[PDB]
């Protein structure tokens, strides 16, 4: 049976190799949700400007 | 019956020889189960990150 | 100053028109987050399967 | 921004497609440990046969 | 004095214009300090591995 | 200063890249001390075959 | 340093080796001392043949 | 096995040489953060100047 | 049997000769583990420079 | 029966002559077991060196 | 005196440079005294062999 | 001072080398005193043969 | 046995001769350690020139 | 039986003659052991030189 021992490893590889693909498989998501944030501020800064609730109507 | 005494020795040699094959018949297994341990870790690092169980719901 | 009264309506237009863009702007999101849900199921299944916590060690 | 909306579906696809690879990924392991079983029986049968422990030495 | 009134505006501009330069003058810093974090982890994962402080020497 | 912002990213790189050299660097050691245990056994086996300490001289 | 990792294995060798030399080395001794016990008998038998001590002289 | 002993020293070398890289690796950081300091003073000086808080309104 | 007494002396040899191979077979190891100690020092020097543990958080 | 008396002496000769063969028959054994001795010392010298039994575990 | 500021840095050098020379100036000594220990042993093995002091003269 | 370090050794050598000369310096003495022994027995065997002290003269 | 008495004198020689090699052998060591004491002084003199310990800080 | 009386004198001879051989036989020994005493002195003197035992450790 000497030589030809190429099975057994593979499993070690499927486990080890998969580490590379799964590791760089995340980094992409980070900015997706976060980047937007700024774009909604400009509409907010105009139309709205008077925080003062003021007196209550009918009282 | 002098000469021709080749039997008794085979039994000595059917046991002794078997020592060579059996001895190098176990080393293969060692790594099989082991090596894998590393691969499953990356998935577990990302999705899971907050050990903090937090407070109990409804209490 | 008969005629030449093409201002005023622009305001009506910008306000009215903005409805067309903004009312087609949203629809894109919806599916974005929702579709995913079907990819994580196939790894969760196989590696896990025994809900039975079993007895507590040391007791 | 009519058309050109081919980004959102990739996540849907990665989440989906991944299902095909992972679902055929497993089946290989099943027979890996189970097949063996039969091979160890033949040696056990010959060198062992008298279940009868017999009497205890010195008593 | 009619016409030639180009001064007063510069002040409105020196203040308004500076808004553009100062606004895109911060975004650069964000990643500088943060990105590094990851690189120092690998030396930490090897040489170190046994959290268990163990028993106290001389006691 | 538009473009030419190649400096900051290097830090991200020195930290991130070093992650490669260091990770591959440790694997060499594991086999080194371990493989030896087998060679010392045969000498030990012949000269030392009697465990029975026997009686104490002078008593 | 990819490839060129042929040292760490010599030790695995050397120790793994040596098993072969040492193991076939001992078999020589067994017969040396034992085969002799059959040559001393023929002189002992003829000159000596009367176990009977007989009576004690002077008594 | 006279000669051919060029392995052992590699460890000594990797351990020793690594000193050269790492002892030149640093140095770059030092000035990075410190320099800046002088740039923010010029704007703070002109728009601010009256330390005297003065009296409190409504008292 | 005058002359031809070349056996016996081999044993005197095999024992005596082996003294040579075994004696010059251990010296290799000495440097192996030792030499390394120096290389781990530089990383340890920079990142860690403040021994002062400081005060205890929350007290 | 004068002369021809060569039978009586042979016994005297067999008894005598045998002295020569038996006398030089021994000397060979002397160094057979004694020479070895030295060859086993070198392995003992290395792998063992700390006579100090040290403290007893668990006490 | 813009430009021509090459002094101060020499002092920065001269001290830093001296680190290289002094660092690789001690490693030479290590083996000097050590290596000798083995040589004096052979004379001491032969002439002296009987640790047993024996009885005291005149008593 | 790189290279030319051939002094520090030598001592290691005079100490080591001397082991070879001193080790084979002995051996010769062994048989010098011991071989004689036999040559004095033949005169003793003749001339003396009557251990019996016999009776004491004058008593 | 007239003449040929050249063995007994070798011992007288070996012992008498070795007197020559050993006698001139030692003279080498003397200078080795001693000559050094003069090179360490110069660095000691400049950096350290104030013996006066001075007052104790905090008292 | 006049003449031919040459026997009786041989005994006188053999006995008388043996004096010549045996008398010159001994002289060889004398120096053998005695000359050596001058070779051991030159190693004893350099390595040892301080007769003074000094104080006893721990007292
Ligand atoms: C005992 C159960 C073990 C296990 C046992 C196994 C076994 C057993 C096997 C795998 C295999 C695989 N495992 Mg697994 N695996 C485990 C855990 C995982 C998990 C998980 C999240 O739990 C996942 C998703 C993976 C992922 C994977 C894949 C890498 C692979 C299935 C085919 C594939 O996609 O390769 C896609 C691509 C590759 C495998 C890389 C090689 C592709 C080459 C051949 C393409 C041609 C190359 C071209 C000619 C040259 C140019 C290429 C470039 C330009 C350089 N494993 C579990 C815990 N795994 C199989 C495998 O390794 O493939 C044989 C396999 O036999
Ligand atoms: C938000 C977090 C989501 C997630 C979001 C993402 C996002 C976002 C992306 C991925 C991507 C991927 N995800 Mg995901 N993913 C999740 C859950 C999973 C899990 C999991 C176990 O939980 C795993 C392991 C996967 C697995 C995968 C891979 C299929 C893929 C990474 C590259 C790759 O290996 O494709 C290897 C092979 C392919 C992708 C198939 C296409 C390969 C083609 C381009 C090769 C050339 C074809 C040739 C020219 C034509 C001939 C081919 C044949 C002969 C027909 N995802 C998590 C829960 N995933 C990335 C992706 O889909 O790639 C763009 C990606 O952008
Ligand atoms: C994991 C630990 C497991 C284990 C797992 C393994 C693994 C893993 C392997 C073995 C293998 C073997 N094991 Mg196992 N084995 C276990 C228990 C046992 C026990 C025991 C008493 O406990 C024994 C003695 C055996 C016995 C054996 C042998 C059958 C075989 C080693 C080579 C050999 O001798 O095949 C001699 C002959 C054969 C294997 C039959 C095939 C021979 C063919 C190739 C010769 C040429 C054929 C010719 C071209 C065509 C004409 C032929 C005829 C004329 C028809 N195993 C333990 C419990 N065993 C190995 C094996 O099965 O070989 C691949 C192997 O890879
Ligand atoms: C703030 C402190 C941070 C840190 C901040 C920095 C900073 C700041 C810098 C580095 C730099 C480096 N860091 Mg760092 N670094 C940290 C942690 C580490 C640790 C550690 C184990 O803790 C180490 C040893 C490393 C290792 C390294 C090196 C990769 C690099 C020093 C030069 C070098 O060796 O590049 C050798 C080789 C390269 C850098 C790759 C590029 C080489 C090219 C230019 C050669 C020519 C290419 C040729 C023309 C094209 C063909 C090439 C091939 C055939 C394709 N860093 C700490 C935690 N590091 C410096 C750097 O990245 O270089 C400028 C740098 O400026
Ligand atoms: C760390 C301390 C370890 C140890 C580590 C080492 C290290 C390290 C090394 C050795 C080496 C050796 N060890 Mg070790 N070894 C240990 C334990 C043992 C013990 C013991 C009883 O404890 C012994 C005596 C051995 C015995 C041996 C020798 C086999 C070998 C020294 C040279 C030699 O004799 O090779 C004699 C012959 C051979 C090695 C076989 C190869 C000879 C070839 C090169 C000759 C030419 C072949 C020709 C061209 C082709 C035709 C040949 C045939 C016709 C087919 N080791 C101790 C416990 N050992 C060295 C070694 O193995 O050499 C590389 C080595 O590197
Ligand atoms: C037992 C565990 C030990 C250890 C044992 C090992 C072992 C074992 C090895 C290393 C190796 C390495 N170790 Mg280490 N090492 C330890 C501690 C450290 C620490 C640490 C911070 O603790 C670090 C990060 C280092 C860093 C390093 C690297 C220098 C090297 C991995 C490849 C490399 O980067 O070479 C980058 C470049 C070089 C090694 C210099 C030589 C490059 C040449 C070959 C390129 C071609 C030259 C060209 C043809 C000529 C022109 C060149 C110039 C123009 C003059 N070690 C740990 C504590 N280390 C390996 C090594 O050094 O490779 C042999 C190695 O064998
Ligand atoms: C009574 C039991 C005794 C004992 C009895 C014997 C007996 C009996 C024999 C051995 C033999 C051997 N014993 Mg032993 N031996 C004992 C104790 C030991 C111990 C031990 C650590 O206690 C060990 C490991 C050894 C080691 C060895 C080996 C040296 C040798 C087996 C072959 C070999 O390896 O030679 C490898 C190499 C050589 C033997 C050197 C000669 C090789 C030549 C022939 C190769 C060709 C030379 C070429 C043509 C010319 C160029 C060469 C160079 C370039 C100059 N013995 C036990 C305690 N030993 C056998 C032996 O000595 O060989 C005949 C043998 O017959
Ligand atoms: C610090 C004090 C150390 C010490 C330090 C030193 C130092 C230092 C030196 C010596 C040297 C010597 N020491 Mg010392 N030595 C110590 C302990 C000992 C002890 C002891 C019993 O404790 C003894 C007696 C020895 C013995 C010796 C001698 C081997 C040698 C003096 C010349 C000589 O005899 O070489 C006789 C022969 C040789 C040295 C072998 C080489 C001869 C070659 C050059 C002749 C020509 C070769 C020819 C051209 C080629 C063919 C040759 C063959 C046919 C193959 N040392 C003490 C404890 N020793 C000296 C030495 O080793 O010489 C350099 C030396 O420098
Ligand atoms: C009884 C125990 C006695 C003792 C008895 C013996 C006996 C017996 C013998 C020795 C012999 C030796 N003893 Mg001693 N010896 C004792 C004490 C000592 C001590 C000691 C520290 O106590 C030491 C280390 C020595 C040292 C020595 C060596 C000089 C020599 C072993 C070979 C050798 O090295 O010669 C190396 C070199 C020489 C001997 C000089 C002659 C070399 C010539 C033959 C080389 C060729 C010359 C060339 C053709 C002409 C050109 C030469 C020049 C250019 C002029 N003895 C003990 C106390 N010793 C042996 C001896 O004297 O050699 C026969 C020997 O037989």
φ, ψ for residue E50, nearest 5 deg: -105, 95
User: Nearest CA to I29 among L13, G7, F41, F43?
Assistant: G7
3-state secondary structure of A57: coil
User: Nearest CA to F13 among I49, H31, H14, H28?
Assistant: H28
Secondary structure, 3-state, chain F = CCCCCCHHHHHHHHHHHHHHHHHHHCCCHHHHHHHHHHCCHHHHHHHCCCCCCCCCCCC
3-state secondary structure of J29: coil
Q: Does an interface of 3+ CB pairs under 8 Å exist between B and N? A: no
Q: How far is the CA of L12 from the centre of ligand 9 (A)?
A: 22
Could you report how far apart the first and last alpha carbons of chain M are, in Å?
A: 97
CB distance F40 to J47 below 8 Å: yes
Angle at K27 between CA K23 and CA K31, to 5 degrees: 170
Q: How far is the CA of F48 from the centre of ligand 7 (A)?
A: 21
The first and second tokens of residue N41, run together, are 């002195």
Q: Can you tell me the distance from the alpha carbon of E18 to that of H47, in angstroms, rounded to the nearest whole number? A: 14
Residues of chain L in Cβ contact (below 8 Å) with chain K: 1, 5, 8-9, 11-12, 14-19, 22-23, 26
The first and second tokens of residue M21, run together, are 């090699």
Handedness of CA G37, G42, G47, G48 (dihedral sign): positive
Q: How many residues are recorded in chain B?
A: 59
Ramachandran bin of C43, using left for φ above 0, alpha for ψ from -120 to 50, beta for the remaining angles: alpha
Q: How many domains does chain B divide into?
A: 1
**Per residue in C13-22, is it b (16+ CB within 10 Å) or e — as a string?**
eeeeeeeeee
Handedness of CA I19, I23, I24, I25 (dihedral sign): positive
Between E29-36 and F7-25, two packed helices, what is the crossing angle to 10 degrees? 10
Q: How far is the CA of F38 from the centre of ligand 5 (A)?
A: 14
- Residue indicated by tokens 């005598």: J16
Q: Does an interface of 3+ CB pairs under 8 Å exist between N and G? A: no
In this structure, how many other beta carbons lie within 10 angstroms of the beta carbon of residue E3? 5
The first and second tokens of residue E33, run together, are 């300090």
Q: Can you tell me the distance from the alpha carbon of K11 to that of K20, in angstroms, rounded to the nearest whole number? A: 15
3-state secondary structure of L6: coil
For chain N, helix (H) and strand (E) counts, in that order, are: 3, 0
* Non-local CB neighbours of B38 within 8 Å, separated by 6+ positions: A15, A16, A19
Q: How far is the CA of L24 from the centre of ligand 9 (A)?
A: 11
Residue C18: alpha-carbon gap to chain centroid = 21
Residue M24: alpha-carbon gap to chain centroid = 13
The first and second tokens of residue I12, run together, are 């005197």
- Please provide the DSSP assignment of N2-22 as one string: -S---SHHHHHHHHHHHHHHH
Residue D7 DSSP code: S
CB distance A29 to B49 below 8 Å: no
Which residue among A8, A9, A19 places its CB closest to the CB of B38? Answer: A19
* Non-local CB neighbours of I27 within 8 Å, separated by 6+ positions: none
Q: Can you tell me the distance from the alpha carbon of E11 to that of F44, in angstroms, rounded to the nearest whole number? A: 96
- Residue indicated by tokens 């520090």: L8
Q: Which residues of chain J does I17 touch, with a Cβ-Cβ cutoff of 8 Å?
A: 39
The approach used to solve this structure was cryo-EM
Q: Residue A30: give its domain's CATH number.
A: 1.20.5.950
Q: How many residues are recorded in chain D?
A: 59
In angstroms, the Cα distances linking L11 to A25, A39, E16, F52, M27 are 62, 80, 84, 47, 14
User: Nearest CA to E45 among I49, F22, F12?
Assistant: F22
Which residue among C32, C39, C46 places its CB closest to the CB of D26? Answer: C46
The first and second tokens of residue M2, run together, are 């007239």
User: Nearest CA to N33 among M15, M21, L24?
Assistant: M15
Angle at F19 between CA F17 and CA F22, to 5 degrees: 120
Q: How many CB pairs under 8 A join A and B?
A: 33
Q: Can you tell me the distance from the alpha carbon of J42 to that of J44, in angstroms, rounded to the nearest whole number? A: 5
- Please provide the DSSP assignment of chain H as one string: --S---SHHHHHHHHHHHHHHHHHHTTSTTHHHHHHGGGGHHHHHHH-------SPTT-
Residue N55 DSSP code: P
Q: Can you tell me the distance from the alpha carbon of L40 to that of L37, in angstroms, rounded to the nearest whole number? A: 6
CB contact under 8 A, M11 and N43: no
Ligand 5, atom 28: closest residue by C-alpha: G14
Could you report how far apart the first and last alpha carbons of chain B are, in Å?
A: 97
- Residue indicated by tokens 């000559």: M35
Q: Can you tell me the distance from the alpha carbon of A42 to that of A44, in angstroms, rounded to the nearest whole number? A: 5
In this structure, how many other beta carbons lie within 10 angstroms of the beta carbon of residue I9? 13
Question: How many alpha carbons fall within 13 Å on the CB side of residue K39?
Answer: 14
* Non-local CB neighbours of N49 within 8 Å, separated by 6+ positions: none
Domain extent, residue B50, equals 1-59
- Residue indicated by tokens 């944030």: A37
User: Nearest CA to D11 among J26, A25, K54, G19?
Assistant: A25
The first and second tokens of residue K7, run together, are 């002094």
User: Nearest CA to J33 among I15, H17, B49?
Assistant: I15
Residue C56 DSSP code: P
* Non-local CB neighbours of F5 within 8 Å, separated by 6+ positions: E28
Ligand-binding site membership of M3 (annotated): no
CB distance M8 to N28 below 8 Å: yes
The first and second tokens of residue G19, run together, are 């098993």
Largest CA distance in chain C: 97
Q: What share of chain K is helix, strand, coil (3-state, %, to 5)?
A: 50, 0, 50
In this structure, how many other beta carbons lie within 10 angstroms of the beta carbon of residue G35? 9
The first and second tokens of residue H46, run together, are 């002109």
Backbone Cα Rg of chain H: 29
The first and second tokens of residue L41, run together, are 């027995």
- Residue indicated by tokens 């104080």: N55
* Non-local CB neighbours of H34 within 8 Å, separated by 6+ positions: none
Residue L4 DSSP code: -
User: Nearest CA to J46 among I11, I30, K46, H6?
Assistant: I30
In this structure, how many other beta carbons lie within 10 angstroms of the beta carbon of residue I34? 14
Rounded to the nearest angstrom, the minimum Cα separation between J35 and chain I is 5
Find, in chain C, the residue whose alpha carbon is nearest to that of D16: C39
Resolution in A: 26.5
CB distance M19 to N42 below 8 Å: yes
Residue N50: alpha-carbon gap to chain centroid = 35
Q: How many residues are recorded in chain F?
A: 59
């Amino acid at each position: 049976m000497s030589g030809g021992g190429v099975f057994t490893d593979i499993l070690a590889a499927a486990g080890r190799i998969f580490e590379v693909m799964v590791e760089g498989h995340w980094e992409t998501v980070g900015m997706l949700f976060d980047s937007l944030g700024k774009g909604t501020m400009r509409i907010n800064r105009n139309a709205y400007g008077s925080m003062g609730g003021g007196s209550l109507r009918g009282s």
